[PDB]
């Protein structure tokens, strides 16, 4: 009967299910929600448009939403991030999913449109779960009538939240959102420790390069740059860090990294003469982590050491100037999501040319494109937050509020600290960790409840 | 003919001056402010009561405040934290200071009273710089009339800020304060990296013990606990972490520590039966980092491995139950701020007894008691913030405001992010770090100024 | 019209060749030998039986031997270690190779036989290059007449060398050997840093498990155990180490590991009562590194935590008692080289059973089975030694010596320190490292030549 | 009425004894020998000339030698290494010791002469325990009749052993020696992990500098350089390494250090033009670890960054060219064993001069000069070996052998591996480590006894 899906190969379903059964055992916060809320069915009647990397971890999120009563229609938010066995297992469970590894851009857009439309007409969606804001943008621009009946958006990523806050400032956001990224059990777990796990993993899978003893430049030292720099330093790389934010740069210095700029004195004068050629001529590996544009620009790429690896773990495909490389230099596929870019010109190359760079995942998320992204026990935190955020906005029923009541609730908000702590506690117990209970005297002394929350909203962890 | 001081030994002044000249070269943010504001004299007319560890680093702070036009009267906020050469150098410069290493509690109170009183009468103070809140409490309880002429308090430490926020919530705070602690260039520099540097330093100076291969228990995993755990792990200790806050415990797990409780199932019901005797019987070193009371309690001390080291880098002398040890067990001074505590009874000890613990700094701040606290290049951040906070509150002139205007400004506030970034930039340049300048295109892409600030006020770093 | 090979898929040749061209740029010592000796053709007339993991790195070794004039016939020394693209590239270059990933044991023996036989008769072999000693053993037991014409064996691995030294002690060794393992640029490069790179790589590829915060037990702390312990600790695992050698255990303690035994008091009396069930009940990962038998025995496997991962990076398939698991417990293939072993019985399992272990590479070398083994820039050292050792024994022409002269040369020897240093220098230059030249006065002061060797033969590095 | 000593202050004895009693609890291998051999008095009649750093650790060694029946006469082998409380405690126990912190060179020679002479005439010495070979050299050159009656020398340090091997090769060594340094429980414990503990300790005590984020250059990567590099990297320094030995350089690369030379292309032709001014102009700290001469030369000192710290943890005072600095530049004592060296000229300096270096311990061993050297639990290994070596040579009674029998025993040898393992085992047990016992089957499989030794003499650990 069930045909409402499109995946690479449905015969991978049994493999996907074996990996989902393992992943459940690695996701105690998400499986804890599944057990706590099963009887109450808090997402009964929820119809969720989901756009996030169709991994095994996203599989456990989907099956938790469904176990709590939701229906979903799913796509990946990246052309290389799907695990074909995860997409097959979800299709085989009778869930609409449109995702495969190695989509074209045209197929990416088609997949999102297959979630929005059921049998050629808008689905009766009433919730959105987004990673990076592409689905959110398409609904606002192309399907405004659908947003009338949507109660909320839950957004995974730093870049997606930035796009929501821009819409809210400009008065174009039509439904409330939860900023899932800024839970501590997301931002200071997934963004940092996920990249610590998955960056060196992706570089090894793609290149099998020794990292020990080699020179890296990490562009950015936010949550992703911090985790990326550690991924590489812990392998024995000599890591230098670039930053525009002097507070983040101060953290890099204290963490034991040299803070450098690709530009002389940190100033881009619009010419190749402002590039620190001596510095870039020694770098074996550049990683972009910024959420910004052209932080590894054409003139940097021209100055890099021969056979340097270039990758992006931040956003989109334009942290590195891949457009410059597509226009000017010859691409030689080594294997999927690994290209040698020959700096000898556009029209062919010598197979034994020494003057190339290695680009991973065509300048798109390297951890998800060349490996499997973050591990289950880290994504547990992010995805437990996603479930709690879906429950919160679905129960508030914004779409059913009268105009005057909507105006008061139209916001981009974080989950309460108490929920962030309850997710953290399930993660700690998954490690076999034992938190201490405050005595009444101690709770009084520091001015908190024995139940928490334990820190004021200003606390930075 | 200057006599308005009390220090251990004025003949240490020349040594103090030599170390102050080195410290100036290690404190570019603080010396940057000294050079930028010297001509403007923004603290002309300021009369500052200062109570903070009389170290070489505090010496550079005092001489910066004086260089910007202030008069000060100074004491230490801890009986063991004074560096006698720093106190001597400050006295020799004609600045009133009442501080020596190894004060009694009675001498500590006398020293604070000597700052408050000049020639037997209240000094015409109009500013307060505090670390831990003891001076703040004495002014509110004993000298309320003096607070009528005081424009503000600048408070250094987590515990001091907690005490200010309690006064504000109870309506007993009489003057506005700046929370210096919660500048990122304080809390996420000093509290973390300071303890990283100075905890293993103090344990080595006191005991000369090998740390590698030994078992530690760090109680707390806030900023101080994070830095403390790293101090020990980086030396090759096997570190276990205790926490009441599940988010901080999650961080400890992800950072590669086992999270344990001294109590079975984390429940302290006050009985010896609740103590995890198997765990505590393997611990060679306990460090308290909490700012809470009785987190290393009598029953834990009884269960500790023979010859374990016990120390506190958080607050006061009651994180460890030192009162229990003073009443019940015999103390053998090894050398100043190092005592063997013989668990054989309160009266006689055998010089060759094997059943003892080693207590550092009598359960008071170990980094400052057994070594020299944080290094100059870290305290640069904290003390640049102190100077900016003093300038801000002095210029606001709260004490001269009409009643209606006072009411609107009576708060506990942090410095603006822009100043936090300007401190960080001077610290980065001290390392020879080069921040990148955003292009206008990049600044517009992430919605910030090329000049910063670079992050929203919610950002946690 | 070359057909003298058997590989998984000859159409993988182009991909293999792209990866060989990258590997050449990562192997400066091996490519330095290729360039230095090309003109001399020192292996002209050498006919080498090779048995070592048919990886990209082994590909560069093979083509170096051929570039120096050798003919070879090749097989893999492990049923899971072949990279099918590497085997294809070598076949497509017209080199006899019999190797694929996922051989049966019967296919493994048939592949070695295809190297020994050409067109149904013993090949006119005159050199052996071995890893683990299986080919060496087959020649001695089954083809002793072939050894009459063989000039020597060059042996890669600790276990293979141990087997050669046993043959020499028993007087059963028929040709001289070089112990390649005990070059410092092999043992203290490959064995240690190779495993550091490739152990966490293999565990991530097989399971995608988070390692940070979890408990590991590494059995052994020789070169492989040291590198393995670091692989895990650098990811944030809490690593405990087992050893029988108290000197290696001393090193583990000092390196910051707790040293534990699976057995109470370290005494394995073969009973379940001797197992430390509390210790094994907390372990998430066991790694064997010993080259010994039954160091993760049936009683340990029964006591392990549910869903623990078990793997071997040492030798054979019997460091872990895989025979006990094949007899007693049901194996569920997750994907190739990843099995769940259900401790509920032999005859099938509940798909949702929680009581299983995860076995990687069926208890055989996990780095080569679940990933790609050591990276090119590490194997450069091992394989430069292999080439120098082949040249040395081929030039000595043992098989052509009179009986009296044979007797004096029948030994298992290491390469001279001077060659070890010349390999190391090419590796250092590959990192862009610059070695200092001694002045004549300095060389005289420490009693060495400016050219080296720099250390006496007793030096341990 | 014991007066046969010279120390700084006999009233420090009680403090010394308290620290000796603690040190006993940290030295289980040395205290194990004291307990095992007490009844047998193996050193009854031994009269030992001892020249080694008069630390608390040396005190426990001395009192073990005395407890086993020896008489000794002691001096320090370094002018800054004595702990005055240790020297006092040894004098107060009625043991001849001539040692204080801050000897002149003339006092150093006088102290050694006070051990050799008792009441103005040669002591009836029959054993030597030396560190660095100065006492050994004096006996050979000045007191050859005394060597007739001496049974052996036990030598602590790499440099001392090199001097013994030179005497043996030249036929000038008069008595046999044990090379204590090359026990694995010395060289790969003390030399490496001792410096790891004590290098950052000494730099903090001397300067209180932040190390995190600053640039270091470690000259040498033998056991001392390895431990020194780790001391600094673990604190967050960015460490570069220099070497002449390409094998040691390879290890530095793999351990995650950049390998550089102070000289362009590593060629030290004695010209200023050969200095890499750009490299040295960024270095905040140079540490020499070589046992060689002029490895931090005048032209390097001229090129160093302003306010760089320079120190030596290797040997003598001429690894750094201190003689050049004494001749050309003005020394300003900060405090004992800390000098600012003003590069503005020889005579006066400006108190606020920015152009200086900081020299620790006047270029002599920094760990012992500015802190307390290695900790008790590490020196346990070195000193257990010293005691075994004294017992071995004393029992052999070389001086009582006839000329022809002396000739066969005149050697420089190491202790047998079995004793090295027995020292290691006591050290492991002191950490609470549990070694596994081999089964009979396992011991047979790897060809060792269940009792050990576990490795061949060629094994490098
Ligand atoms: N790949 C993944 O699995 C993964 C996980 C989490 C988030 N992300 C994405 O990674 C990006 C970074 O996320 P984050 O949470 O670290 O954001 P963040 O704001 O915490 O960090 C980004 C940092 O980049 C710095 N930066 C900006 N422009 C720069 C420039 N030109 N040069 C140097 N530094 C520059 C900023 O100062 C900032 O500190 C976002 O796009 C986010 O969505 C990816
Ligand atoms: N010694 C120094 O140089 C230095 C430096 C900075 C701050 N401090 C002091 O250190 C203390 C901690 O400061 P912080 O900035 O880390 O505060 P914080 O609030 O960041 O961290 C304190 C941590 O203690 C934990 N905690 C509380 N009670 C506990 C208990 N019973 N068991 C386990 N964990 C418990 C809390 O959950 C919290 O995470 C304060 O008193 C502060 O003033 C000292
Ligand atoms: N997978 C790879 O890529 C790779 C690389 C190098 C070598 N190897 C193999 O790894 C194995 C180990 O090699 P190595 O060079 O480390 O040898 P090694 O002799 O240096 O180390 C082996 C260690 O195992 C210890 N050991 C033995 N039995 C033990 C037991 N019952 N419990 C605990 N510890 C025990 C020994 O004391 C020794 O220290 C060998 O089989 C070698 O051929 C594998
Ligand atoms: N301070 C202490 O507590 C302590 C402890 C042990 C030994 N030592 C002394 O430290 C010194 C080193 O001992 P070790 O055991 O490390 O010796 P080692 O032989 O293992 O190491 C010395 C290293 O210096 C390198 N080297 C020599 N000249 C060099 C140069 N010009 N540039 C760069 N590298 C150069 C050599 O190649 C060698 O690797 C000796 O003098 C030893 O006696 C001191
Ligand atoms: N605390 C200490 N006491 C005695 N000797 C020491 C100490 N620290 C280091 N040493 C020795 O100093 C020697 C160098 O002179 C080293 O070989 C080491 O064994
Ligand atoms: Cl622009
Ligand atoms: K994953
Ligand atoms: K300090
Ligand atoms: K490989
Ligand atoms: K010491």
Q: What is the dihedral of CA C385, C386, C388, C391, to 10 degrees?
A: 170
- The residues pairing with B128 across neighbouring beta strands, listed in sequence order, are B49, B153
Q: Mapping DSSP to helix (H, G, I), strand (E, B) and coil, where does residue A376 land? A: helix
Residue C54, in any domain of the structure: yes
Backbone torsions φ then ψ of A126, nearest 5 degrees? -140, 5
| Cα D353 to averaged position of ligand 6 atoms, centre (Å) | 43
Phi and psi at D446, nearest 5°, equal: -100, 0
Q: Residue C239 forms beta bridges with which residues?
A: C216
- Pairwise CA distance, residues C164 & C176, whole Å: 9
Q: What are the counts of helices (DSSP H) followed by strands (DSSP E) for chain D?
A: 20, 17
- For the question of residue B374 being annotated catalytic, the response is yes
With a 6 Å cutoff on the Cβ, whether D180 touches ligand 5 is no
Which of D236, D253, D254 lies nearest to residue A256, judging by beta carbons? D236
C60 is known to lie in a ligand binding site: no
Neighbours of ion ligand 7 (CB under 5 A): A 372; C 208
Q: Are D149 and D126 contacting, i.e. CB atoms less than 8 angstroms apart?
A: yes
Contacts of C275 (CB under 8 A, 6+ apart): C262, C263, C264, C299, C300, C302, C303
CA distance A232 to C166: 42
Asked if residue A380 and residue A355 are part of one domain, the reply reads no
In this complex, is the C-beta atom of A379 within 8 Å of any C-beta atom belonging to chain D? Answer: no
The H or E element containing residue D327 is helix D322-328
Q: Phi/psi at B405 (nearest 5 deg)?
A: -75, -40
Q: What angle do CA B104, B108, B112 make, to 5 degrees?
A: 165
User: Chain C: nearest CA to D460, how far in angstroms?
Assistant: 4
CA nearest to A89, candidates A27, A175, A9: A9
Same domain, A70 and A217: no
Query: Which ligand sits nearest to residue C296's alpha carbon?
Result: 3
Choosing from B130, B131, B319, B321, the catalytic residue is B131
Residues A354/C22, Cβ–Cβ less than 8 Å: no
Q: Is C291 on the interface with D (CB under 8 A)?
A: yes
Cβ atoms < 10 Å from Cβ of D134:
18
The pair of structure tokens assigned to A241 is 């860090």
Phi, psi of A291 (to 5 degrees): 75, 15
Residues with Cβ < 8 Å from C213, sequence gap 6 or more? A431, B253, B254, B256, B257, C236, C237, C238
Domain that holds residue D222: 209-314+317-363
Show the CA angle centred on residue B352, arms to residues B351 and B354, nearest 5°.
120
Cα B162-B164-B169 angle, rounded to 5 deg:
95
A232 shares its domain with A347: yes
**A243 pocket-lining for ligand 1 (C-beta < 6 Å):** yes
Annotated binding-site residue? D271: no
Question: Looking at the structure, do residues C77 and C215 belong to the same domain, yes or no?
Answer: no
Specify if A437 maps to a domain.
no
State the catalytic residue, choosing from B374, B390, B420, B426.
B374
The answer to whether A76 is a known catalytic residue is yes
- Strand, coil or helix: what is D104? coil
Mutate to test the interface with A, among C14, C208, C336 (most CBs of A within 10 A): C208
Tell me which residue has its CA closest to atom 21 in ligand 4: D222
Q: For residue B256, how far is its CA from the centre of ligand 2 (angstroms)?
A: 20
In a domain, residue D402? The reply is: yes
Is D114 one of the annotated active-site residues of the chain?
no
Ligand 3 site residues, Cβ closer than 6 angstroms? C 157-159, 190-191, 194, 219-225, 242-245, 248, 289-292, 295, 313-315, 365, 367, 373-374; D 436, 442, 454
- Tokens coding B106: 């009675």
> What are the C-alpha distances in Å from A32 to residues A18, B71, C375?
20, 61, 41
Distance A266 CA to ligand 6 centre (A): 14
Neighbours of chain D (3+ CB pairs under 8 A): A, B, C
- Residue ID of nearest Cα to ligand 2 atom 1: B313
Contact A378 C214 (CB under 8 A): no
Q: How many angstroms separate the alpha carbon of residue B156 from the centre of ligand 10?
A: 35
For residues D297 and D288, what is the distance between their CA atoms, to the nearest angstrom? 11
Q: Is residue B398 part of a domain?
A: yes
Cα(D170)–Cα(D315) distance, integer angstroms:
23
If one counts every other C-beta atom within 10 angstroms of the C-beta of residue C402, the result is: 7
Residue C121, both tokens: 């008769």
Give me the number of domains chain A comprises: 2
Q: How many A×C Cβ pairs under 8 Å? A: 95
Contact between C20 and C59 under an 8 Å Cβ cutoff? The reply is yes
Let me know whether C345 and C277 are in one domain.
yes
Contact list in A for residue C30 (CB cut-off 8 A) is: none
* Whole-angstrom distance, CA of residue D295 vs CA of residue C441: 11
* Six token digits for residue D268: 């030290």
Kindly state the helix (H) or strand (E) to which residue A320 belongs, with its residue range. none
Is C315 known as a binding-site position?
yes
3-state secondary structure of A2: coil
Buried b (16+ CB within 10 A) or exposed e, D139-171: bbeebeebbeebbbbbbbbbbbbbbbbebeeee
Ligand nearest to the CA of C131: 3
Q: Clarify whether residues C260 and C213 are in a common domain.
A: yes
Report chain A residues whose CB lies below 8 A from the CB of B427: 246, 250, 253
State if residue D219 touches ligand 4 by the CB under 6 angstroms criterion.
Answer: yes
Q: Where are the alpha helices (DSSP H) in D329-416?
A: 366-370, 376-396, 403-409
Q: Rounded to the nearest 10 degrees, how much is the dihedral formed by the CA atoms of A142, A145, A148, A152? A: -30
Q: Of A213, A215, A255, which is closest to D254 when you measure between CB atoms? A: A213
Query: Using CA atoms, how far apart are residues B393 and B404, in angstroms rounded to an integer?
Result: 18
Joined tokens for residue A167: 């819409």
Q: Is residue B334 part of a domain?
A: yes
Residue D441 lies inside a defined structural domain of this protein = no
Locate the chain A residue with the closest alpha carbon to D252: A213
Q: Are residues A86 and A24 in the same domain?
A: yes
Q: How far is CA D137 from CA B140, C40, D78, D144, in A?
A: 72, 52, 15, 10
Residue with tokens 């272990």: C357
Cβ distance of D432 and B351 shorter than 8 Å: no
Looking at residue D100, which CATH number applies to its domain?
3.40.50.1480
Question: Which residue of C212, C235, C255 is in closest CB contact with B236?
Answer: C255
Neighbours of D306 (CB within 10 A): 13
Partner-chain contact D433 C294, CB within 8 Å? no
**Three-state secondary structure call for residue D118:** strand
The residues with which D130 forms a beta bridge, in sequence order, are: D51, D155
CB D26, CB B210: distance < 8 Å: yes
Q: What is the DSSP track for C131-192?
A: SSSHHHHHHHHH-HHHHTT---EEE-SHHHHHHHHHHHHHT---S-EEE-TTSHHHIIIIII
The single residue listed with the structure tokens 């029953």 is B299
Residue C368 lies inside a defined structural domain of this protein: no
CATH for C351: 3.40.50.720
Statement to judge: residues B44 and B148 lie in one domain: yes
D55 annotated to bind ligand = yes
Q: Is A292 on the interface with B (CB under 8 A)?
A: yes
Answer yes or no: is D146 within a domain: yes
D423 and D347 within one domain: no
Q: Measured between alpha carbons, how far is A53 from A81 in angstroms, rounded to an integer?
A: 5
Q: Are residues A44 and A93 in the same domain?
A: yes
Please check whether residue C248 is in contact with residue C225, taking contact to mean a CB–CB distance below 8 angstroms: yes
How far apart are alpha carbons C390 and D184 in whole angstroms? Answer: 33
Q: Residues near C147 by Cβ (< 8 Å), separated by ≥ 6?
A: C139, C140, C174, C175
Q: Count the Cβ atoms, other than its own, within 10 Å of residue A277.
A: 16
Contact assessment for residue D61 and residue D22, using Cβ atoms and an 8 Å cutoff: no
> In Å, how far are C101, C358, C364 from C339, measured between CA atoms?
16, 6, 12
Known binding residue B191? Answer is yes
Q: Are residues C168 and C270 in the same domain?
A: no
- Residue numbers in C near B255 (CB within 8 A): 212, 236
Asked if A230 and A300 sit in the same domain, the reply is yes
Instruction: Give the DSSP per-residue string, C51-62.
Output: ES--SHHHHHHH
């Amino acid at each position: 009967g069930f045909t409402d899906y499109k995946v690479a190969d449905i015969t991978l379903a049994a493999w996907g299910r074996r990996e989902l059964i393992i992943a459940e055992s690695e996701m105690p916060a998400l499986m804890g929600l599944r057990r706590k809320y099963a009887g109450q069915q808090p997402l009964k009647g929820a119809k969720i448009l989901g756009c996030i990397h169709m991994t095994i971890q996203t599989g456990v999120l989907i099956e938790t939403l469904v176990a709590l009563g939701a229906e979903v229609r799913w796509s990946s938010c990246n052309i290389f991030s799907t695990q074909d066995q995860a997409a097959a297992a979800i299709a085989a469970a009778g869930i609409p999913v449109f995702a495969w590894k190695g989509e074209t851009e045209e197929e990416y857009e088609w997949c999102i449109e297959q979630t929005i439309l059921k049998d050629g007409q808008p689905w009766d969606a009433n919730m959105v779960l987004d990673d990076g804001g592409d689905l959110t943008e398409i609904l606002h621009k192309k399907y405004p009538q659908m947003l009338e009946r949507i109660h909320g958006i839950t957004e995974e990523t730093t870049t997606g939240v930035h796009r929501l806050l821009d819409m809210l400032k400009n008065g174009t956001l039509k439904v409330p959102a939860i900023n899932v990224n800024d839970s501590v059990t997301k931002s200071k777990n997934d963004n940092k420790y996920g990249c610590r796990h998955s960056l060196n993993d992706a570089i090894k899978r793609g290149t099998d390069h020794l990292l020990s003893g080699k020179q890296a430049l990490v562009i950015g030292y936010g949550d992703v740059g911090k985790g990326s720099s550690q991924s590489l330093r812990q392998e024995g790389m000599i890591v230098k860090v670039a930053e525009v934010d002097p507070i983040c740069a101060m953290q890099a210095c204290m963490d034991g990294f040299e803070v450098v700029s690709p530009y002389k004195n940190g100033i881009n004068d619009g010419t190749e003469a402002s590039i620190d050629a001596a510095l870039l001529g020694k770098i074996d590996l550049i990683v972009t982590t910024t959420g910004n544009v052209n932080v590894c620009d054409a003139n940097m790429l021209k100055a890099l050491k021969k056979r340097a690896v270039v990758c992006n773990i931040g956003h989109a495909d334009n942290e590195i100037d891949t457009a410059f490389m597509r226009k000017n230099w010859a691409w030689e596929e080594v294997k999927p999501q690994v290209h040698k870019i020959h700096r000898t010109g556009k029209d062919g190359f010598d197979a034994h040319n020494d003057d190339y760079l290695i680009l991973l995942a065509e300048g798109r998320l390297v951890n998800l494109g060349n490996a499997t992204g973050h591990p289950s026990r880290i994504m547990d935190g992010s995805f437990a937050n996603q479930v709690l955020a879906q429950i919160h906005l679905f129960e508030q029923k914004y779409a059913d509020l009268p105009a005057a009541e909507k105006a008061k609730r139209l916001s981009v908000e974080v989950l309460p600290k108490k929920l962030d702590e309850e997710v953290a506690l399930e993660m700690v117990k998954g490690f076999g960790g034992v938190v201490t209970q405050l005595t009444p005297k101690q709770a009084e002394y520091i001015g908190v409840s024995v139940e928490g929350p334990f820190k004021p909203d200003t606390y930075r962890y």
